[PDB]
């Protein structure tokens, strides 16, 4: 139920998220593009600075008036093939170097922490106030710096599959935003797109997203979703924590199989007024795929001795999730203190650095950083016993992978549907059927991915926004409008890319997309989109 206070809390969370995104964009531009800064910041430094910035900005808002507030989604910086979960701590730099010594240079940017030109940097963060969550995620491109020009500008645009992925993600994001805003004005829906008397459906959302992805030769990563958000239920841990009710459209290997052959989410819903929607879209480039294949996810572990692969990434996830349904009294006093601090956080993913009393830093000092690392040592000590009793779990690190269909079809599985991973710590990914019609389970799919010689990784571009469909009473100007809490032309401005693919104007869905764009640009007799602005700092 939308109200003045709920809308204000959502707006404050969105403003803080936009300001944090502006802060990280400025930091990255100073570190690698303007090159004015003497010292180049690394990925853990950027993540820690972002978390501290979010906490310091949120400290001034709703003090002693809202019970619970804080970071909803920890700041995640994902590079190229990494599709999520990359928020390494500051005390893991030497560990990462030692773990990945003797490996390839494919994950060199993530291992070293230093960005490289041509990298797709995906920045994701979320802020919640009283359980009302606003989340933003933006893909940007790292460029080499021109020297002859008086003004700092890239030497040239991004070309290739990364450009295809960025264009597909941006176009899909804008089109889905326009389509959801069309739900408040059902008579403004294009006829070729769908029924004039009919509303907005998950089928229409899915077919628009699939049309754009197929036009740009990209796949939808199995984590993408367009769902409804309520209080304390934002899908901050979708693959970890189960939910009673779900309203949205998801993409999986099962959906890929069904499209090829043409709690459970279903695309049989109508978008309603007065609702909050999160749109997270990940597009994986299919430039190097000369065959027809399947897009899947590989989980990154911290064990170097599990295989001998040269192009394997070894890392430890930086974010944890507390399971409040599990109770166990710990033997270590440090572990009990850490569990009390973790319970003081809430139901959102947290970092170990977030639990330090020094964090967030008031004045950024070397001694402050040393005190933070000293706290982190004992935090790791306590976390070892906390995780050993299933009280907390990890948010995984996932890499997009491509598996050809012919290998899957030629594969044999003597168990079929009955097989499942019995060694999985988590219930939800352990009991999964990514190929229900072929009877191939998750463990069998991972076995095929590891056994195949042509299993490559795919670069991923991500765009994720949060919107509210304000009705006539909720809205300021007595007419329904879409409040985009995160994203827009000010924070999520597209980078310089060029792609050889484009939408094909001879298709009805493409014409509907064009009409959606035209009606979104029309501010008088079209759709009304109000974007949340970032608050000023200096």
């Amino acid at each position: 139920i939308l109200q003045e206070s709920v809308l204000n809390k959502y707006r404050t969370a969105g403003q803080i998220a936009q300001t944090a995104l502006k802060y990280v964009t400025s930091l990255i531009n100073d570190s690698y593009h303007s090159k004015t800064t003497q010292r180049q910041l690394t990925v853990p430094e950027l993540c820690l600075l972002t978390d501290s910035f979010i906490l310091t900005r949120l400290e001034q808002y709703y003090k002693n008036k809202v019970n619970e507030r804080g970071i909803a989604i920890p700041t995640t910086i994902d590079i190229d093939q990494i599709s999520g979960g990359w928020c390494p701590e500051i005390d893991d730099t030497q560990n990462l170097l030692n773990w990945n010594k003797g490996k390839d240079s494919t994950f060199a940017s993530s291992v070293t922490g230093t960005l490289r030109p041509g990298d797709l940097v995906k920045i994701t963060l979320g802020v919640h106030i009283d359980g009302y969550t606003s989340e933003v995620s933006h893909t940007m491109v790292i460029y080499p710096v021109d020297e002859t020009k008086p003004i700092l500008q890239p030497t040239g645009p991004l070309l290739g599959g990364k450009a295809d992925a960025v264009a597909a993600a941006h176009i899909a994001m804008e089109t889905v935003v326009a389509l959801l805003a069309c739900a408040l004005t059902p008579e403004k829906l294009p006829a070729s797109l769908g029924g004039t008397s009919s509303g907005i459906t998950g089928q229409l959302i899915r077919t628009i997203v699939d049309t754009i992805a197929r036009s740009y030769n990209c796949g939808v990563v199995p984590g993408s979703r367009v769902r409804r958000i309520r209080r304390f239920l934002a899908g901050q841990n979708e693959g970890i924590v189960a939910e009673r009710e779900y309203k949205g459209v998801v993409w999986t290997e099962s959906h890929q199989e069904a499209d090829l052959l043409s709690a459970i989410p279903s695309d049989d819903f109508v978008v309603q007024s007065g609702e909050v929607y999160l749109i997270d879209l990940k597009m994986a480039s299919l430039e190097h795929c000369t065959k027809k294949g399947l897009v899947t996810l590989e989980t990154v572990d911290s064990y170097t001795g599990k295989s001998h692969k040269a192009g394997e990434l070894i890392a430890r996830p930086g974010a944890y999730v507390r399971d409040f349904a599990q109770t166990h009294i710990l033997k270590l006093k440090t572990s009990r203190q850490l569990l009390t601090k973790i319970d003081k956080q809430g139901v959102y993913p947290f970092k170990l650095s977030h639990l330090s009393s020094n964090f967030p830093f008031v004045h950024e000092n070397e001694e402050e950083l040393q005190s933070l690392k000293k706290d982190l040592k004992s935090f790791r000590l306590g976390m070892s016993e906390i995780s050993n009793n299933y009280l907390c779990v990890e948010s995984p690190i996932q890499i997009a992978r491509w598996v050809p269909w012919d290998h899957i079809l030629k594969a044999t599985n003597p168990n079929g549907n009955l097989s499942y991973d019995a060694t999985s710590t988590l219930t939800l990914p352990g009991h999964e059927l990514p190929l229900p019609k072929l009877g191939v389970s998750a463990i069998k799919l991972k076995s095929l991915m590891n056994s195949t010689k042509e299993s490559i990784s795919l670069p991923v571009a991500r765009e994720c926004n949060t919107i509210v469909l304000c009705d006539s009473s909720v809205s300021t100007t007595d007419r329904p409008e879409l409040l985009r809490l995160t994203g827009g032309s000010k924070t999520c401005q597209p980078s310089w890319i060029h792609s050889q693919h484009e939408l094909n104007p001879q298709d009805s869905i493409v014409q509907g997309i064009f009409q959606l764009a035209t009606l979104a640009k029309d501010k008088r007799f079209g759709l009304l989109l109000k974007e949340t602005q970032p608050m000023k700092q200096k």
Binding site: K292, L409, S495, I497, H498, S499
Partner: peptide, 26 residues
Amino acid sequence: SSLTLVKEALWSVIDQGTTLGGPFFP
């Protein structure tokens, strides 16, 4: 067999442009 039919169907099925941004750093 239904699995045979599904596998046969899958086997038989598998058998300017655009420009965003500009010359600057956002």
